[PDB]
Design a protein around this ligand. Structure first.
Ligand SMILES: COc1cc(N2CCC(N3CCN(C)CC3)CC2)ccc1Nc1ncc(Cl)c(Nc2ccccc2S(=O)(=O)C(C)C)n1
Length: 361
């Protein structure tokens, strides 16, 4: 007891995907004749899979009527339902016939489902805002994609959402939703209330006893053990990409680079040969441990990026921070073993941090 679906506004249609990039359309259509409707970079486009490729048709509008090449209709849903029913080729020259509408997935949210609050910085692709779900005031982080990035990079942006949809762990930041209906597109995450771990160490560091710091890097080890168990390589592990909850729990984030430039956190073999692995993540973990005990000082402050590569390639490593227990430094040195196979696992790291922590008041 509602109204016919075809009488609902375009923007309510399940097969209307809004501002999804042309690139992303290829990931959503499976079988011949799958289609969806979307906005273009601005008129409307009917994207339909044909011979394994998306084909894109401009829906024209003249004197309030929508059409491809024939009979015009008062709305896009009416046009869609007519093309679907008559099994008409969309245009003669293409010969393409619609077969099934592909709905938005369970994660898509409308822009109006969010209330933006204060800007909280910038990530690799745009501003990030604190905000709330309008429905229930749940606190969220809204990561925006700068509307003038290359449509090729709206892909690397939406890739973090694709990954996170499949992950669930107490030390990994949780995805809430994806706002791809309007520009600018947003990825919506739980708001981790204490901010990023770098600013935390720099602002709150004086209060963080060794026992506490060990609990927080223990959390980062548990998160990374989880990613290792999913064959997920983070590639950008650093304090700036860890977040701190209001109860001091650490969560790993920033899965844009992740896969199933920050030279100073990156393993030699990853820089030299492009070989990224969970072993190169353990290298980055050693650097994170250094940041942790240096109250967020920057690593290798005497060295350019290039000098860091060269320094490391002749056996240079970071020195032991004043606050860093000797046992933690010995662990860090294992994490930065030149031979990647000689580095400890995340399980081993977690175990040794937990053990060291019982020796601190
Ligand atoms: C309240 O929650 C947060 C506050 C801050 N800060 C950082 C320092 C900043 N001060 C403010 C003014 N001061 C004068 C100096 C600096 C205030 C707010 C930073 C991050 C969060 N929370 C948060 N949760 C989830 C995500 Cl998902 C995320 N993501 C997120 C947030 C901000 C930037 C980048 C990302 S990110 O996703 O690209 C990745 C780096 C975590 N950020």
């Amino acid at each position: 007891s509602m109204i016919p679906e075809v009488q609902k506004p375009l923007h309510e249609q399940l097969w209307y995907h809004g501002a999804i990039p042309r690139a992303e359309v290829a990931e959503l259509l499976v079988h011949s004749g799958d289609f969806l409707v979307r906005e273009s970079q601005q008129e409307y486009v009917l994207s339909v899979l044909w011979d394994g490729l998306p084909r894109h048709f401009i829906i024209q509008s003249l004197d309030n009527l929508y059409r491809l090449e024939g009979e015009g209709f008062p709305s896009i849903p009416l046009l869609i339902d007519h093309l679907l029913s008559t099994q008409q080729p969309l245009t003669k020259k293409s010969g393409v016939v619609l077969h099934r509408a592909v709905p938005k997935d369970k994660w898509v949210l409308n822009h109006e489902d969010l209330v933006l609050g204060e800007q909280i910085g910038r990530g690799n692709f745009g501003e990030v805002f604190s905000g709330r779900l309008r429905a229930d005031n749940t606190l969220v982080a809204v990561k925006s994609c700068r509307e003038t990035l290359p449509p090729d990079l709206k892909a690397k942006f939406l890739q973090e959402a694709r990954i996170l949809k499949q992950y669930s762990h107490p030390n990994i930041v949780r995805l809430i939703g994806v706002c791809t209906q309007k520009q600018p597109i947003y990825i919506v995450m739980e708001l981790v209330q204490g901010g990023d771990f770098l600013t935390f160490l720099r602002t709150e560091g004086a209060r963080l006893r060794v026992k506490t710091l060990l609990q927080m890097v223990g959390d980062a080890a548990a998160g990374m053990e989880y990613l290792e168990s999913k064959c997920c390589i983070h590639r950008d592990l650093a304090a700036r990409n860890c977040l701190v909850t209001e109860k001091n729990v650490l969560k790993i984030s920033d899965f844009g680079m992740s896969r199933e430039v920050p030279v100073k956190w990156t393993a030699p073999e990853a820089l030299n040969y492009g070989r990224y692995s969970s072993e190169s993540d353990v290298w980055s973990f050693g650097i994170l441990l250094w940041e942790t005990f240096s109250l967020g000082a920057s690593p290798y402050p005497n060295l350019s990026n290039q000098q860091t590569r060269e320094f490391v390639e002749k056996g240079g490593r970071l020195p032991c921070p004043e606050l860093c227990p000797d046992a933690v430094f010995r662990l860090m040195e294992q994490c930065w073993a030149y031979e990647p196979g000689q580095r400890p696992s995340f399980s081993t790291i977690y175990q040794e941090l937990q053990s060291i922590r019982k020796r601190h008041r």
